[PDB]
Enzyme design. Structure first.
Site, short mmCIF file in Angstrom:
data_model
loop_
_atom_site.label_atom_id
_atom_site.label_comp_id
_atom_site.label_asym_id
_atom_site.label_seq_id
_atom_site.Cartn_x
_atom_site.Cartn_y
_atom_site.Cartn_z
N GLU A 215 48.36 34.83 11.27
CA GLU A 215 47.74 33.56 10.88
C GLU A 215 46.94 32.94 12.01
OE1 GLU A 215 51.41 32.41 7.79
OE2 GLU A 215 50.74 31.00 9.33
N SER B 48 44.08 42.78 34.31
CA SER B 48 43.14 42.07 35.17
C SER B 48 41.79 42.76 35.10
CB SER B 48 43.66 42.03 36.61
OG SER B 48 43.45 43.27 37.26
N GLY C 249 39.09 48.59 38.59
CA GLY C 249 38.69 49.84 37.97
C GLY C 249 39.64 50.31 36.89
N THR C 250 40.86 50.67 37.28
CA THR C 250 41.81 51.23 36.33
C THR C 250 42.16 50.23 35.23
OG1 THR C 250 44.00 52.21 36.07
CG2 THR C 250 43.73 50.60 37.84
N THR D 239 38.05 38.31 45.12
CA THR D 239 38.74 39.22 46.03
C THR D 239 37.93 40.48 46.31
OG1 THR D 239 40.86 38.38 45.23
CG2 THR D 239 40.88 40.45 46.45
N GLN E 17 47.45 46.76 38.24
CA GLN E 17 48.37 46.07 39.13
C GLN E 17 48.65 44.65 38.64
OE1 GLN E 17 48.42 44.05 43.31
NE2 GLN E 17 47.46 46.07 43.52
N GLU F 32 47.79 54.16 40.20
CA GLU F 32 48.24 54.08 41.58
C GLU F 32 49.75 53.86 41.60
OE1 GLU F 32 49.38 51.28 43.53
OE2 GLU F 32 49.42 52.52 45.34
N1 LIG Z 1 46.60 36.32 37.99
C1 LIG Z 1 46.73 37.41 38.75
N2 LIG Z 1 45.63 38.18 39.05
C2 LIG Z 1 45.76 39.28 39.83
C3 LIG Z 1 47.00 39.65 40.31
N3 LIG Z 1 46.85 40.77 41.04
C4 LIG Z 1 45.54 41.13 41.02
N4 LIG Z 1 44.85 40.21 40.28
C5 LIG Z 1 43.41 40.22 39.99
O1 LIG Z 1 42.98 41.54 39.73
C6 LIG Z 1 41.69 41.76 40.27
C7 LIG Z 1 41.53 43.21 40.71
O2 LIG Z 1 42.22 44.08 39.84
P1 LIG Z 1 43.72 44.54 40.21
O3 LIG Z 1 44.67 44.22 39.08
O4 LIG Z 1 44.16 43.88 41.48
O5 LIG Z 1 43.63 46.13 40.43
P2 LIG Z 1 43.57 47.12 39.17
O6 LIG Z 1 43.35 46.35 37.89
O7 LIG Z 1 44.84 47.92 39.10
O8 LIG Z 1 42.32 48.10 39.46
P3 LIG Z 1 42.32 49.09 40.72
O9 LIG Z 1 41.72 48.38 41.90
O10 LIG Z 1 41.50 50.31 40.39
O11 LIG Z 1 43.74 49.51 41.06
C8 LIG Z 1 41.56 40.81 41.44
O12 LIG Z 1 40.28 40.23 41.45
C9 LIG Z 1 42.61 39.74 41.20
O13 LIG Z 1 41.99 38.51 40.92
C10 LIG Z 1 48.12 38.88 40.01
O14 LIG Z 1 49.22 39.20 40.44
N5 LIG Z 1 47.98 37.76 39.23
MG LIG Z 2 45.46 49.04 41.87
#
Ligand SMILES: Nc1nc2c(ncn2[C@@H]2O[C@H](COP(=O)(O)OP(=O)(O)OP(=O)(O)O)[C@@H](O)[C@H]2O)c(=O)[nH]1
Ligand SMILES: [Mg+2]
Ligand SMILES: Nc1nc2c(ncn2[C@@H]2O[C@H](COP(=O)(O)OP(=O)(O)OP(=O)(O)O)[C@@H](O)[C@H]2O)c(=O)[nH]1
Ligand SMILES: Nc1nc2c(ncn2[C@@H]2O[C@H](COP(=O)(O)OP(=O)(O)O)[C@@H](O)[C@H]2O)c(=O)[nH]1
Ligand SMILES: Nc1nc2c(ncn2[C@@H]2O[C@H](COP(=O)(O)OP(=O)(O)O)[C@@H](O)[C@H]2O)c(=O)[nH]1
Ligand SMILES: [Mg+2]
Lengths: 150, 430, 430, 430, 430
Positions: C245, C131, C135-136, C170, C11, C62
């Site tokens: 480089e 991020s 998980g994913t 979070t 996400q 998702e």
């Molecule tokens: N900088 C930034 N960080 C984000 C954003 N959205 C989620 N995160 C970070 O991503 C972490 C959790 O992973 P997510 O990207 O939200 O979810 P995911 O990587 O798809 O993993 P799943 O929960 O299995 O779907 C959180 O702790 C947030 O700090 C965003 O829009 N910008």
């Molecule tokens: Mg997600």
């Protein structure tokens, strides 16, 4: 007259009796100080205090919680005076609150003791008479002094 | 995709569902005739979560209604939005259980459950990707607490990898309406811990307390308690039906709120709640929501949350708001209350944001926290159970239908072991 | 004849990919429909007549975010079948997205990668965004990196990972999968850039003067950093720098490739034009510890090498006159075995502004990529957070039951200990 | 910014507020429905001082209304501008105090005050930058003089650095409506000196004298006294809501009018005041305003200001006027009356100018002077108290609710000490 | 390549800064929007294309005046983020603005000063304006001067302080902070000019024939004096004078740098043209004791050195012929150890007129900056006022409770006694 009062302190702070409380205050770091530090760690403002120091709020809570105020120190200003007198040489750096670096809190406790002889002075007089103060007699003397002071 | 089916049993569960489905239909703009009349495009994109599609363009809930007596389902059909339910899903017996757990779990509930399991299997095999099941039932009744819990085990045996939800109303000792409540409560808690993936306890006493103190309405009725429970139920799955900044399905909450597989008994609460006369005074802000969210009187259970320490917590914000404020407020609510949070697991609060608020409200929050304070409910339930069992009072009713006292002893021992091992982690230190 | 492929998974990855892809389309004059009303070739490909197709692929299990992408204004831009989507989310479980559901999706992604790579003739390398605290994201990023490292070999891969903040979080279980993903990408990624959210929140609050930021404001700054990094490949400049480089200039040893970034100037149009924005003041602001894009203090450690990019009308002599001033200062000290540590790049194209955004239009900007010894603090604090819960084996059952072995947690801990020892061993003077 | 909240208690305080808020709303052009209909731009720039913002664009005062009986608040709601008050802020008991100070401070007022303190804390924690609180209550009643003063101590204990205002009506011996006035007046003055940062005494006798002699209207009513008090109240904070030549917030007045921390009891007066038939004869000039401002009959207290010497004085001019004239007139009023000004503090008159006059008037002045003549009120109050207490009349009502005669003796002694040490500086010479 | 930076702190400082910045913009032809429809470089900076930005910074803790500035016609001129504003006012308390709230704001001001200084290449020095009789003005001026004296060192700083009048006063506590600020700037400022309001009121009344002046009329005269002082840096002249050429000509000893100014001619257009305004008569009027810009009598003391600026079509021989006449007069006597005491500057640009103002257009003008021994009277009277209240320790609690020590008042008294002794020691003949 003002110069004479100023000339009068610091010697009391260097006395072995005061250092022993503060020596015992090292043990407060050993356990009482570690507990107070753990309470200061519950303050989010801890980011503004050195990891080895306690806040004024934690020191005031200690004085209240251990019946140092009102039983030994009748005036809450004396706790602030003790704290300020111990921390007097510490400069406020980066807007961080001044902590008890080793003993501004120990110096504040001395000012509470010396500042107001009161409940602790009555305990000292009873002990000097060879009367072993049990906790019930201490509580009664503290209640009687708190009633005379209110 | 990732949809769930609804299964309810007993009179209390049927009355809860009769308002839950009304709330869902009002949220999605579905008329009581099954015809969509909504305003926004998003109201139809993820309608497959709860509703099926039939010819003629109308929608039908995938709910299954079961009871051992026909009266409650014959009454819910005449209520508003009662026509949505498919007549085929109504299954009932002709005898009833009479608040006797043995009759609703061994003699009568065993023969009937095949028909309801047939329709349950029909519903689950068909759906696109199963997410799981959610169960509403009461622990204070015989037929409900028996048939529902046996159905839990039967479903778990066939779908071991899916997720299972249970919203369980436990009998409080303050407002008691049945004398045999401790027996079927204790027997049900024994089976419920072994199979349910999530459990959410709800108490009528806490609902009355909330209605009398926060809403300050003069005459509470079951309709208000049902409405509060329905709002809380809808708040959990909101982000699964609507877009948001951080989507979080039920499985993600299961991962983050259950540290050990046997500690899955949560207590919930909904914010905001304000009286009619003070709804104009208040201003809806994130601090105002979070201060009411962690309020002790706002919990849907009589358990006092400052009598223990939270193992973990969760919040599901609704509406459009800044994430920075949410994160800083969550940090602040955790720094100022460090004494009530367990110390060997840092950062134990989960947050999520959904951009679609409830109809009529600009912001809303659903709170799900796993706390050690829940031990007090099992303590008092077991206390009443052991006060009544030592004299073998009312025991012959249960023992006349093939049950014995050994299953009572095992249930009491397992419940006490659960109570002990739940508080074991309260005194644990790093 | 120079190309680069960007991978977006999770996400957060998709939400920052959207942010960078408005900016690139705006910077190259391409309308959201993909139609222009020879520099585009780095990120895009010509279809023969008309529209341009991005060299990007979006991954997620998702479906909500992808569905949001496929209905927005950019529905016509991306190729319909490179937005790979799953059905079931990993739900913050790392073992799920590495062993259970990610394996069945990874083959389609690899097929898409091959189909995109056969089109490019001068492939510089790959970019990946994920991020880490999910998980994913972490699991699929690890699996994709591991597959690419053997399918292609020596091609360079760059990772813009977003680690969790020191105290703001979070989720509650993100240290586990953060540590595991760091284990996975330690031996598999050539460059990793730190991007935690708290530092960027502070940057927005202090400079942009926004008191309620959302994720979009953060992602726009990240997109600007990416554009500044890759500007040298598609615009004429007096001192060019290529992606290949880097490991010859910023990476002293194969293990050490985690570095933290900064950007300057960051200022709003309401007070930008009142000051001259000379090169000296912007290059001073870029080195300020409070303007680090990751919440780490550079004053706590030595510098190893600094690679810093300019763009606009900057003259090299003014750059040298400012590097000398920084070498003069006593608060910034470099490591003993590095006499010169600066690599300088100069480009002519000024940064582009996005309408309705936060940043104003300026003629000079600086982006620095600096490798420093102080980065070990984030590893130490993540390790401390991990140990607290791994002492009691909390939340482990959610990972053991998804196919992962018990011992897999320990070796990640050992690799982090090895990395921390290596960082201490390098920073001591001879 | 630097805004204050309003808290009122008792019947007299509620009636004062019911006109104070009407005056403020008329000044800012707010209709009784909460909708702005003003003419000037300045009417909205600093509206955050007293009014909050809610959805729908309407404004709501941040006032808190408390009483021990529901009648007065049930009556103020039906009056004009009664709908502005938020229904949530109304807190009341079911018993009342019966003009007994002990009941309103020890037995009944102690249990109720938690609810009102909750909403007080809600209001203060939320606001941008707190300036302080202002309190309106009467010393002639039981519930008011008890609960208000205990609330003063509770607020001071939690916000020691903020400023606190109290507008206190003391019972005059001329117009007496309650026989037990001296007891609860003397008990309240004891607590009021220890916690209030500022106190402003108002007497009904002086208001009747003013209405009969200056305005010369035939039949005064409580509405006229309330209107005069409301105009005086609004005049103090005018420059904090409007621009001016020399802005002066409440803290600046606190610095300049209180020489010693225990001397903070002021008497006030408002100018101009003219009859309906003579409003055309008079011409509004600075000399005409200043001659009426220092007039003895114009003071809101029966205390005669030429029976003592002013420690300091303050004036808050309104309207657009030349500063040179104001300064020269202030000098002239101090050279011609050197006998009534203490000599060891030179230049003891403070002046301020605000460019926004009251609606309907071109110039206005609010006068706040700290004088030694206030001793006469405490003298007569203590005289009546000691005349009634020596026989222990009506003492059993107070002593039956946990209070004793020792607290009466201490209160009398402290009040006499205050009287003595207030006049100590009258005879002091340099 | 010659620049100067002006600092405005406090309400009086900002209100005189506005007055000088209409005049400079009018004199250099720049419209209020900042756009012209090589002399500007002293006060302004070129942005590359179009508008000019003043080299000035506005400081205040109380936001009203800055908000008034940011909405007037000059909203487009100043850079948006150099108008530093606070939230809470110091409220005439010196200890507040030096120890409590000024410290958190001073860092931003110093950052702005650095950002403005790095742009200048030929920085002549700093100008600062502050009304002394206020909390924030005096406190922040002291703190800024103390920081600048160590950050930059030998750069020259000029202070245009406004001391209180002998008898006319607006506050009651201004002697305390006036004495403390004099202590602070005695050892930290290179030049201090006297500006009390009473003398300028008398000047306006006698010459301009205005019977009701306001602060704007005073500030326009001060702005004209500033323009006359700094004209020599940005216009061609037969006899130029630089800022650095002052301590070598007007400051006999490092301690003595307080001098008082005068201006001539001051006349209205209604009777200006009836008389020829020769250089002799204007230079006679400038030396008249009644035309001093500070309420001090030069006949009570000796002169030390006179620096006096001309502008217009004046010829040097006429200047010499008038200096001889002044040396002739018996009522003006210089100190024994100074045979010649005049420094003369001649400029060609006539003074500019502001539309709607008081002064008319003339071809000749003279501005004198004279250092005289008679200035000790203001110090003596301020000291006498201070001692009266410091004898009884009045108003001290408002300062001790803001972090200041008890003994800090005494040493300022000792430094004033030292200054008064030094002024007596210098004025005696050998
Ligand atoms: N900088 C930034 N960080 C984000 C954003 N959205 C989620 N995160 C970070 O991503 C972490 C959790 O992973 P997510 O990207 O939200 O979810 P995911 O990587 O798809 O993993 P799943 O929960 O299995 O779907 C959180 O702790 C947030 O700090 C965003 O829009 N910008
Ligand atoms: Mg997600
Ligand atoms: N010449 C002149 N003096 C002024 C003006 N405004 C205020 N003063 C003087 O300033 C003194 C008080 O200081 P102020 O400037 O008004 O207030 P401040 O410096 O901002 O300090 P605070 O009260 O804390 O806000 C008064 O005694 C006035 O004599 C002005 O416009 N012109
Ligand atoms: N919230 C709610 N609770 C109900 C309602 N009706 C009954 N209950 C609760 O359910 C309990 C009795 O359960 P019961 O009807 O015997 O369940 P059954 O045996 O499955 O039919 C009582 O203690 C009530 O508190 C209702 O309409 N709403
Ligand atoms: N100015 C004004 N004074 C009032 C009004 N009503 C009552 N009072 C005064 O308040 C005093 C009685 O106070 P009381 O009502 O007993 O206060 P309570 O005990 O808090 O309710 C009387 O002496 C009146 O002079 C009113 O409407 N206006
Ligand atoms: Mg001011």
């Amino acid at each position: 007259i003002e110069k004479v009062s100023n000339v009068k302190i610091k010697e009391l702070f260097q006395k072995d009796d005061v250092q022993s409380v503060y020596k015992t205050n090292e043990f407060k770091l050993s356990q009482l100080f570690f507990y107070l530090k753990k309470y200061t760690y519950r303050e989010i403002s801890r980011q503004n205090i050195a990891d080895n120091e306690i806040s004024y709020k934690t020191f005031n809570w200690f004085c209240y919680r251990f019946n140092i105020y009102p039983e030994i120190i009748s005036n809450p200003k004396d706790i602030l005076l003790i704290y300020r007198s111990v921390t007097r040489n510490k400069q406020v750096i980066d807007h961080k609150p001044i902590g008890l670096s080793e003993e501004e809190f120990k110096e504040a406790m001395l000012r509470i003791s010396i500042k107001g002889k009161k409940i602790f002075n009555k305990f000292s007089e009873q002990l000097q008479k060879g009367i072993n103060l049990n906790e019930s007699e201490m509580a009664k003397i503290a209640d009687d002094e708190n009633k005379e002071s209110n | 995709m990732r949809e769930i089916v609804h299964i309810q049993g007993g009179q209390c569960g049927n009355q809860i569902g009769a308002k839950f489905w009304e709330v869902i239909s009002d949220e999605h703009g579905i008329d009581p005739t099954g015809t969509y009349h909504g305003d926004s495009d998003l109201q139809l994109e993820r309608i497959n979560v709860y509703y099926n599609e039939a010819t003629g363009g109308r929608y039908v809930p995938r709910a299954i209604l079961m009871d051992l007596e026909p009266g409650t389902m014959d009454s819910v059909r005449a209520g508003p939005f009662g026509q949505l339910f498919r007549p085929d899903n109504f299954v009932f017996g002709q005898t009833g259980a009479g608040n006797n757990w043995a009759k609703g779990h061994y003699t009568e509930g065993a023969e009937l459950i095949d028909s309801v399991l047939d329709v349950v299997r029909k519903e689950a095999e068909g759906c696109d990707c199963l997410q799981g099941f959610q169960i509403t039932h009461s622990l204070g009744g015989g037929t409900g607490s028996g048939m529902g819990t046996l159905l839990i085990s039967k479903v778990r045996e066939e779908y071991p990898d899916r997720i299972m939800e249970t919203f369980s109303v436990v009998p409080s000792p303050k407002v008691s309406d049945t004398v045999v409540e401790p027996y079927n409560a204790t027997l049900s808690v024994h089976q419920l811990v072994e199979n349910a993936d999530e459990c959410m306890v709800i108490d009528n006493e806490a609902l009355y307390d909330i209605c009398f103190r926060t809403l300050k309405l003069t005459t509470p009725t079951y309709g208000d308690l049902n409405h509060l429970v329905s709002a809380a139920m809808s708040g959990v799955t909101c982000c699964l039906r609507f877009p948001g900044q951080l989507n979080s399905d039920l499985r993600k909450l299961a991962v983050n709120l259950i540290p050990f597989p046997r500690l899955h008994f949560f207590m919930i609460g909904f914010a905001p709640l304000t009286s009619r006369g003070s709804q104009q005074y208040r201003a809806l802000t994130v601090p105002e929501l979070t201060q009411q969210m962690f309020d002790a009187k706002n919990m849907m259970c009589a358990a006092d949350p400052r009598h223990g320490r939270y193992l973990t917590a969760s919040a599901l914000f609704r509406g459009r708001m800044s994430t920075k404020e949410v994160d800083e407020q969550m940090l602040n609510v955790q720094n100022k209350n460090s004494s009530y949070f367990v110390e060997w697991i840092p950062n134990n609060i989960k947050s999520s944001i959904c951009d679609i608020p409830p109809k009529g409200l600009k912001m809303a929050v659903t709170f799900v926290g796993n706390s050690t304070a829940i031990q007090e409910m099992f303590k008092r339930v077991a206390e009443q159970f052991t006060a009544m069992f030592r004299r073998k009072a009312f025991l012959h009713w249960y023992t006349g239908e093939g049950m014995d006292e050994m299953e009572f002893t095992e249930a009491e021992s397992n419940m006490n072991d659960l109570v002990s091992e739940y508080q074991q982690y309260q005194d644990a230190t790093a | 004849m120079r190309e680069v492929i960007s991978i977006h998974v999770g996400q957060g990855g998709i939400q920052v990919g959207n942010a960078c892809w408005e900016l690139f389309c705006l910077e190259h004059g391409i309308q959201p429909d993909g139609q222009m009303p020879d520099a585009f070739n780095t990120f895009f490909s010509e279809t023969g007549a008309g529209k341009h197709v991005p060299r990007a692929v979006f991954l997620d299990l998702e479906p909500t975010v992808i569905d949001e992408v496929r209905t927005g204004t950019y529905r016509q831009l991306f190729h319909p079948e490179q937005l790979i989507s799953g059905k079931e989310d990993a739900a913050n479980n790392f073992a799920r997205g590495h062993y259970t559901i990610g394996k069945e999706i990874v083959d389609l992604c690899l097929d898409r990668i091959r189909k995109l790579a056969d089109n490019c003739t001068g492939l510089q390398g790959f970019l990946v965004f994920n991020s880490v605290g999910g998980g994913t994201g972490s699991g699929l990023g690890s699996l994709l990196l591991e597959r690419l490292s053997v399918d292609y070999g020596k091609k360079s891969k760059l990772g813009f990972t977003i680690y969790p903040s020191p105290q703001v979080s979070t989720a509650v279980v993100e240290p586990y999968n953060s540590i595991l993903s760091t284990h996975s990408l330690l031996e598999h990624t050539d460059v990793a850039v730190m991007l935690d959210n708290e530092a960027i929140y502070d940057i927005c609050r202090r400079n942009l003067d926004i008191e309620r930021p959302t994720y979009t404001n953060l992602n726009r700054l990240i997109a600007q950093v990416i554009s500044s990094l890759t500007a040298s490949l598609r615009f004429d400049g007096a001192l060019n720098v290529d992606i290949t480089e880097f490991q010859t200039n910023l990476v002293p040893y194969p293990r050490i490739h985690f570095m933290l970034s900064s950007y300057a100037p960051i200022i709003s149009a309401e007070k930008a034009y009142h000051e001259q924005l000379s090169v000296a003041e912007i290059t001073n602001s870029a080195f300020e510890p409070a303007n680090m894009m990751a919440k780490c203090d550079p004053r706590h450690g030595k510098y190893m090498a600094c690679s810093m990019m300019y763009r606009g009308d900057v003259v090299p002599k003014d750059v040298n006159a400012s590097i000398a001033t920084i070498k003069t200062k006593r608060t910034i000290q470099f490591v003993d075995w590095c006499p010169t540590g600066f690599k300088v790049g100069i480009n002519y194209q000024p940064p582009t502004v996005v309408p309705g955004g936060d940043l104003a239009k300026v003629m000079r900007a600086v982006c620095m990529i600096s490798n420093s010894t102080a980065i070990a603090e984030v590893f130490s604090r993540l390790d401390h957070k991990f140990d607290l819960m791994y002492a009691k084996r909390a939340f482990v059952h959610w990972y053991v039951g998804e196919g992962m072995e018990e011992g897999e947690f320990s070796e990640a801990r050992e690799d982090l200990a090895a990395l921390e020892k290596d960082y201490e061993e390098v920073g001591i003077e001879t």
